[PDB]
Design a protein around this nucleic acid. Structure first.
Ligand SMILES: [Zn+2]
Ligand SMILES: [Zn+2]
Ligand SMILES: [Zn+2]
Lengths: 1181, 370, 114
RNA sequence: AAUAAAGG
């Protein structure tokens, strides 16, 4: 009796961790390779349109990247990336220029239990270093085994392992390792400390750290020591290799700065003055400086200077003052600027600097000069929304009054993002809600065109209809112009603008006519054997296609339309075509003109104009292959557009039977043919239930892009960065006609038909940004946000936040406060103060003067929206906001707490209509560590007991307690049950009885496990418990009394596992859209992604399991990793699919789909039914 | 001198070593730190009284758990030498068994007397908890094994050996256990019935330690016998898998590590030995430095290479596996011999019960002390 | 997540069926034990099957004052103790240290001073 | 009630 489920990645993670600057694509330009957990982004630095970074490529892995390096091999024409994955995996990959993807050059597994020396748990991450002269690489695996990989003058050789502790001067506890600059042989400088100590034991032992220079001879596997030093300060943190011609290392310790070299006494300098009685090293004070160098990032921006990002944000510029022979004499600090909490840092082109951050938005900065001072300027920022510490689910404020009266609810996710000076609230929605400015009722009409007439504001709304048409004047008020030069007599097949909007062309199934306002200039009748059915305008060309397959071209020569017949004599009937006015520079063999044509015999072709010359052909087009290549199923539509900055990135959209296909053009290179190929793009758009379904707009709110109409409508947007954004819009129904619009009521807006015969003139709600994986609004708090709680009846957000101050006192046993008194150069402690704010979803600005400050040293350990019984509401319950507080003085003070029940009320004021009503605030006889509700009671966790309180007449009244585990830190209830979570024991299932007033332990997981959070997998008449652990694993346990190993029911049996690959700290869950009482269970990971588990049937689970095995064994994967060993724990039960792999079936041609479904036995229609139904069921937010 | 709990003593501000501030600090560091490569270093200064995380907060430094700071000494009023000390599974409190057969229950936060019970009719020698935290199992001198519940109630008392039982341990499923005796045999028992499955008759005399394995079915024993000091057993079968000639004196204790790869043993020839449980032909390493015998050993419950030991002279030393020389220690911790050690389930307090009639509490050091 | 969006009230669970019927339950292996157990429903409605050795808490008598050892979790007379195992601070015993002398040393004294 | 006060 198990529970099956799919996993899905509802939002890719955002926080970046590594950055590098290398020749990724080729040896012409260099560009920025940044990484994340399981993600890789190659950005191209622009200098126009004002610097911005254009996303050039993006890849994802079945493995969390643990390190990254670059190398320039022997005969290669680009740099190879050496990536490092879990416990030992060194994978060397490269760029594939003929397919625009990432090829795996080699894969190295160094995972054998002989290498662990006994220890089962691994705490020593892989660390990959590369020699500056690209002559070898090193990888420190398991904290002991130094793997050496030479490169050839196949550019690879047999790697070999070294016992780093077998060397003379046995190494232990390695801190960090580097290669030096300026040696005839490669040389690894290792910083370690043989005799380890603790900041509580520096009185007993110090001067522990040492360094060694291991000169690696790769030709005959010899590696002696050349120089070592000992007794260095106990808390050395980092090593920095100093480029030539200075040439040494710079070693950071928490309180000092050291420079080391050959034949040079260690030049050390103490920065703050906590080096008193903790080092016997000779440290000379640094005068006008008082800082600490832990958790600091550093990079050299010249041979002499370097930049340092401290633990708090401040950016300094260190200069290595030298003698006449570049022997570092003294140092110089200089506080340049302040910035974000970096997590990496790299120097780009001279003048630029990328500060990578997983705690806030990554920043590209610029530095100019003015012995030198550098000022910094934020040039650009990459959005980040992690770590997602907590998440509330609240409803948006305004919804256009037509979109109400709808069954599906309208929801919104507020998330506690960032840390420190960078703590914000991220508001996320998934769809788009068009702000409906006005509505009409025009039944009968089935198509429209919005054309500019006489500064690019739209004139006539050329509508269309069955037998006749209709035209609206639309300058100030939407008024039906009648009796005009246009053709109202028949059904219009096209309408546009030619000659920089100076003209109009209305194409009808009898001829074409060109206009100049209301009056027509010219009309030429078109008869060729068949009626017109297709028309495509690229200024100054017009190409019209017939209902049978003839083609004819027009242009505007100096003033009406001129006839021309294209010499495309061929034996295959034509089905579709389009024109393309290229402003970019990619289509070569400055604007040019291109005609993309599709025939009946499968083929596709691309002609240049006006000559109608062949430059590119594809044999088997409608199948949907993955790279379109120049060769020497009912295709319904085809559209080729240029997007990005200044029309830089061309895509090809295709509507084939029930399928959407998206290609992006990339360059490549018979002879005399188009130098372009077309790589397929993955997506999740569903076309399942002669007018165009693709609608190009530019500047609908400031954005260029396309609208994909149909049963599942979508917005395809691209911005200054070439990041493609695919946003749903299904609040209205299935859209079936669209038009970009610009008036005095809808300035930079749009208008569209739905399928109830209604026009809607609308604009984009101008408070979210649409250049993000989801539409997001960031809200900076300048502090740290811990807990967020949407209070319902008030529609407000209660937010518990903190801020750091210096520290002055020290508590004692009768609670003396021994005041701290040090010299001037003393780095004070840090001390948090909490505040509980209100935030309004209307302006997303904090309500003025409704803020609860809390007593000094009083941390808040929890804040929830609990619904407690009361004789004032209909449903007998009502929601409050409760927060439990721990007053943590120190280790030697009996930690107490306090419970704080607030309400949010309505008062006579704009924003000041809401205030806190502190209904209860009282000290409890122990720490308060988590709380929830259970049928109207406040379930509090005080110390090591769990109490169930009743708030009557505004005073808490005990009713039951129970004795529990070490430290409860999470509790979640459902329907009389409670589920407690502990910090070293896994979980316990509890219960309450209104009648006898008795808690009771239903059962428990007797094994040990370090939980982060816990929730419920709700299924039809079943209930699992979803747990996430310290090891990035989700796990579903159940209560099965008749299971013969759930003995008396007194155990929880792990009925499913899954290795998500990321820490999850918060869950929530929503119903569906076979799915009767199944709930989707969502969560947010501490890396900035969103995910979901969906409960399934077994019948479907087995089919999709067969498919999953076939996909993982029959396809190649990026960097060779396999998606089976990546979803394993650390006994294993694995009743959970992958979801991120099943969607790869959607990315296969129909030939390959048929092959694989036959090698399983099933039918690709049934496969796609399962997959796409799982997709449409989880379409929320 | 009677102490019935009715004497009206004035208040006392008890010397406390609390863990809740440190745990709260750790829960707040989780959300914005990957691991200890994202940790801002604690300073050795007296004002950083809030920047301490528990042993789980840092796994790149086991040195923190070297508890050489005295806290509190817990002596009864009618003194007896202490034989075995065990934290209840949730760290709620601490239990001491002494040579009078009494259980003395001490608090685990302020360390004060809570209660006392007359448990055995004989010096209590063995005390251990099941892996599910439900059953406590005790053994006295020259006699019985008794079953205890979490509230310290006695549900079943059963004669096992005609002579003194020295140690015990549970099966990973807690359904069957072992007892080694002064009769030179190891008897393997069923639990729900008090039924004896096997008798193990390999030793020469006075099996004085036994221990099951966390996953496998192999039971280790250790004796006075200079000819077969350490032996292996298969419980269902009852056959000596191997024999281990490691110590030439009565091997006091024997400990299998939770990763299932390591054995550690301690003997009256001043030494402790770590053995790789699969390759028994050699000695994985020899922990030297004890001016007299070694009598008690205990692995740390969070860190995998850290353990503590105490000898016949009052010393208690702290050792780490990959490390050669002694890591830390306290020379005159007691006056008599340390009989039993116990780490706190969380790993920050160490209790040591000795032959000088007391039991002392040790904790981690404070930043920037004297 | 909220009681408005995802409302599991119209549903019955496997738990709620295997809890109020005591489905997986074996009798006690030793006589005399049961704090942290269900107040037996069958014994309330006079249908207790396990016969005195029921694995869940029997409530035979009526009791008046809170059990002094139960508050610390050390009561051995469970299911047969003379004193309530209920957390009702209005039915707590009287302070010895106040009733005899006249000055309690516990600032947070849970015992009824009077 | 079976040590609530076990800093005697
Ligand atoms: Zn009953
Ligand atoms: Zn009782
Ligand atoms: Zn009192």
């Amino acid at each position: 009796n198990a529970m099956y489920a799919v996993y899905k990645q509802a939002h890719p993670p955002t926080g970046l961790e590594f950055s590098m600057y290398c020749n990724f694509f080729n040896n012409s330009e260099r560009n920025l390779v940044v990484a994340g957990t399981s993600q890789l982004y190659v950005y191209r630095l622009n200098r126009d349109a004002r610097e911005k970074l254009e996303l050039a490529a993006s890849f994802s892995f079945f493995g969390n990247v643990m390190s990254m390096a670059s190398v320039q091999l022997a005969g290669a024409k680009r740099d190879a990336l050496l990536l490092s994955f879990k416990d030992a995996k060194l994978s060397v990959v490269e760029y594939d220029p003929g397919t625009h993807d990432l090829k795996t050059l080699s894969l190295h597994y160094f995972e054998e239990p002989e290498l662990r020396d006994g220890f089962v748990q691994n705490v020593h991450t892989p660390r990959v270093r590369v020699d500056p002269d690209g002559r070898c690489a090193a990888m420190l695996v398991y904290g002991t085994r130094l793997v050496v990989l030479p490169f050839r003058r196949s550019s690879f050789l047999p790697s070999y392992i070294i016992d780093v502790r077998a060397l003379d001067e046995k190494l232990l506890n390695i801190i960090d390792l580097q290669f030096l600059h300026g040696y005839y042989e490669p040389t690894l400088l290792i910083l370690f400390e043989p005799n380890q100590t603790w900041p509580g034991r520096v009185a007993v032992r110090q001067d522990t750290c040492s360094i060694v220079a291991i000169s690696l001879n790769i030709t005959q596997k010899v590696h002696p020591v050349i120089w070592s030093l000992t007794s260095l300060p106990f808390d050395c943190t980092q090593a920095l290799a100093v480029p030539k011609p200075i040439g040494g290392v710079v070693v950071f310790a928490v309180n000092s700065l050291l420079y080391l070299n050959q034949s040079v006494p260690p030049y050390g300098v103490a920065l703050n003055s906590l080096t008193t009685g903790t080092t016997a090293f000779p440290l000379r004070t640094q005068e006008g400086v008082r800082i600490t160098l832990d958790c600091a990032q550093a990079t050299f921006i010249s041979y002499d200077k370097m930049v340092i990002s401290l633990k708090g944000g401040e950016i300094y510029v260190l200069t290595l003052i030298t003698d006449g022979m570049r022997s570092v004499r003294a140092f110089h600090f200089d506080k340049a600027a302040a910035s974000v909490l970096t997590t990496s840092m790299v120097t780009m082109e001279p003048g630029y600097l990328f500060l990578g951050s997983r705690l806030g938005n990554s920043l590209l900065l610029k530095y100019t000069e003015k012995l030198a001072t550098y000022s910094f300027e934020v040039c650009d920022s990459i959005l980040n929304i992690g770590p997602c510490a907590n998440a509330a689910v609240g409803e948006p404020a305004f919804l256009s009054e037509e979109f109400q009266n709808s069954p599906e609810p309208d929801l919104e996710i507020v998330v506690c993002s960032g840390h420190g000076k960078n703590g914000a609230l991220s508001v996320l929605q998934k769809s788009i809600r068009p702000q409906v400015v006005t509505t009409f009722e025009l039944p009968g009409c089935y198509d429209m065109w919005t054309v500019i007439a006489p500064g690019r504001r739209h004139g006539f709304l050329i509508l269309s209809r069955e037998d006749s048409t209709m035209i609206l004047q639309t300058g100030q008020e939407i008024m039906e112009l009648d009796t005009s030069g246009f053709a109202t007599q028949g059904p219009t097949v096209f309408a546009g603008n030619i000659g920089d909007n100076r003209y109009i062309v209305q194409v009808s199934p009898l001829g074409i006519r060109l206009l100049e306002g209301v009056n027509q200039l010219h009309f030429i009748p078109v008869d060729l054997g068949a009626p017109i059915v297709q028309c495509a305008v690229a200024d100054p060309y017009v190409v019209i296609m017939s209902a049978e397959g003839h083609v004819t071209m027009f242009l505007l020569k100096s003033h009406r339309l001129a006839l021309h017949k294209p010499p495309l004599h061929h034996q295959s009937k034509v089905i579709t075509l389009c024109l393309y006015r290229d402003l970019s520079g990619m289509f070569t063999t400055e604007p040019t003109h291109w005609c993309l044509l599709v025939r009946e015999n499968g083929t596709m072709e691309i002609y240049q104009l006006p000559d109608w010359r062949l430059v590119f052909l594809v044999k088997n087009f409608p199948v949907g292959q993955r790279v379109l290549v120049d060769s020497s199923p009912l295709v319904k539509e085809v559209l080729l557009v240029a997007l990005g900055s200044r029309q830089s990135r061309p895509y090809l959209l295709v509507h084939v039977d029930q399928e959407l296909l998206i290609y992006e053009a990339f360059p490549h290179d018979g002879q005399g043919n188009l130098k372009v190929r077309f790589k397929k793009v993955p997506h999740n758009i569903n076309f399942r239930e002669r007018v165009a379904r693709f609608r190009y707009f530019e500047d609908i709110y400031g954005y260029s892009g396309v609208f994909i109409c149909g049963p599942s409508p979508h917005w395809l947007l691209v911005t200054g960065r070439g990041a493609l954004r695919l946003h749903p819009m299904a609040i209205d129904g299935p859209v079936d006609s669209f038009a970009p619009f610009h008036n005095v009521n809808c300035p930079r807006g749009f208008l569209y038909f739905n399928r109830q015969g209604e026009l809607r003139i609308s604009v984009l709600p101008a408070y979210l940004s649409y250049d993000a994986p989801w539409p997001v609004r960031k809200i900076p708090l300048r502090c740290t946000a811990h807990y967020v709680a949407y209070h319902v009846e008030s529609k407000v957000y209660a937010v518990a936040t903190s801020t750091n101050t210096p520290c002055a006192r020290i508590p004692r046993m009768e609670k003396e406060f021994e005041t701290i008194e040090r010299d001037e150069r003393y780095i004070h402690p840090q001390q948090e103060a909490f505040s509980i704010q209100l935030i309004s979803p209307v302006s997303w600005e904090a309500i003025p003067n409704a803020r609860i400050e809390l007593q000094e040293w009083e941390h808040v350990t929890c804040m929830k929206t609990v619904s407690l019984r009361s004789e004032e509401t209909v449903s007998g319950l009502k929601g409050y906001v409760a927060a439990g507080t721990c007053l943590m003085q120190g280790e030697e003070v009996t930690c107490r707490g306090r419970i704080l029940i607030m309400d949010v009320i309505e008062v006579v004021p704009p924003l000041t209509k809401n205030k806190f009503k502190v209904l209860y605030e009282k000290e409890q006889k122990g720490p308060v560590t988590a709380l929830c509700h259970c049928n109207g009671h406040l379930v509090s966790a005080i110390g090591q007991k769990i109490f169930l309180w009743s708030l009557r007449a505004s005073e808490l009244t005990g009713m039951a307690f129970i004795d529990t585990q070490l430290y409860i830190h999470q509790m979640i209830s459902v329907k009389n049950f409670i589920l407690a979570a502990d910090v070293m024991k896994s979980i316990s299932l509890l219960r309450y009885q209104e009648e006898s007033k008795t808690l009771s332990l239903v059962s428990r997981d007797a094994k040990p496990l370090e939980v982060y959070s816990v929730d419920f997998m709700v299924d039809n008449a079943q209930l699992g418990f979803l747990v996430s652990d310290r090891d990035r694993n989700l796990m579903v346990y159940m209560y099965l009394p008749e299971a013969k190993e759930s003995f008396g029911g007194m155990r929880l049996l792990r009925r499913a596992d899954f290795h998500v690959g990321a820490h999850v700290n918060t869950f929530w869950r929503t119903p569906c859209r076979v799915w009767e009482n199944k709930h989707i269970t969502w969560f947010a990971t501490l890396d900035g992604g969103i995910g979901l588990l969906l409960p399934m049937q077994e019948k479907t689970y087995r089919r999709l399991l067969m498919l999953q095995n076939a996909l993982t064994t029959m396809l190649p994967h990026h960097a060779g990793l396999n998606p089976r060993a990546f979803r394993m724990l650390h006994n294993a039960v694995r009743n959970v699919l992958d979801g991120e792999l099943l969607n790869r079936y959607l990315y296969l041609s129909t030939m390959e789909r048929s092959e694989l479904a036959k090698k399983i036995g099933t039918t690709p229609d049934i496969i796609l039914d399962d997959l796409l139904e799982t997709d449409r069921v989880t379409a929320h937010f | 001198l009677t102490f019935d709990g009715k004497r009206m003593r004035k208040a006392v501000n008890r010397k406390t070593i609390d863990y809740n501030p440190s745990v709260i600090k750790y829960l707040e560091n989780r959300i914005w730190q990957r691991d200890q490569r994202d940790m801002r270093a604690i300073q050795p200064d007296a004002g950083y009284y809030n920047d301490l995380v528990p042993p789980i907060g840092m796994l790149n430094n086991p040195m923190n758990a070297v508890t050489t700071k005295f806290v509190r000494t817990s002596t009864n009023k009618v003194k007896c030498p202490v034989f075995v000390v065990r934290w209840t599974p949730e760290g709620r409190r601490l239990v001491t068994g002494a040579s009078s057969g009494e259980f003395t229950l001490w608090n685990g936060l302020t360390f004060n007397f809570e209660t006392i019970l007359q448990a055995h009719d004989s010096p209590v020698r063995a005390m251990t908890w099941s892996h599910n935290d439900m059953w406590m199992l005790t053994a006295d001198h020259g006699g019985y094994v008794k079953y205890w519940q979490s509230n310290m109630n006695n549900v079943k008392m059963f004669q096992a050996h005609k002579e003194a039982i020295r140690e015990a341990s549970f099966s990973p499923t807690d359904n069957k256990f072992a007892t080694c005796s002064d009769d030179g045999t190891v008897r393997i028992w069923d639990f729900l019935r008090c039924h004896e499955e096997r008798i193990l008759r390999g030793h020469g005399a006075d099996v004085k330690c036994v221990d099951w394995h966390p996953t496998k079915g192999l039971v280790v024993s250790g004796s006075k016998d200079s000819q077969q000091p350490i032996k292996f057993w298969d419980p269902k079968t009852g056959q000596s898998l191997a024999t281990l000639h490691a110590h030439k004196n009565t091997v006091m204790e024997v400990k299998l590590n939770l990763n299932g790869n390591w054995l550690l043993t301690a003997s009256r020839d001043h030494l402790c030995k770590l053995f790789d449980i699969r390759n028994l032909k050699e000695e994985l390493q020899v922990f030297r430095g004890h001016k007299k015998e070694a009598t008690a050993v205990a692995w740390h419950p969070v860190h995998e290479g850290l353990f503590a030991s105490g000898g016949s002279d009052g010393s208690l030393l702290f050792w780490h596996v990959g490390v050669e020389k002694e890591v830390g220690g306290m020379e005159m911790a007691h006056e008599g011999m340390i009989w039993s050690l116990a780490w706190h389930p969380l790993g920050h307090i160490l209790c040591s019960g000795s032959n000088d009639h007391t039991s002392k509490f040790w904790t981690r050091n404070r930043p920037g002390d004297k | 997540m909220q009681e408005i969006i995802a409302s599991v009230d119209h549903i019955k669970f496997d738990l709620e069926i295997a809890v109020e019927q005591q489905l997986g339950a074996q009798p006690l292996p030793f006589p005399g034990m049961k704090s942290g157990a269900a107040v037996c429903e069958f014994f309330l409605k006079a249908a207790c099957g396990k016969g005195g050795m029921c694995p869940f808490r029997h409530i035979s008598g009526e009791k008046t004052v809170v059990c002094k050892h139960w508050l610390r979790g050390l009561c051995k007379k469970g299911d047969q103790c003379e004193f309530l195992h209920e957390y009702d601070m209005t039915k707590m015993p009287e302070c010895y240290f106040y009733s005899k002398f006249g000055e309690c040393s516990n600032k947070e004294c849970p015992f009824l001073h009077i």
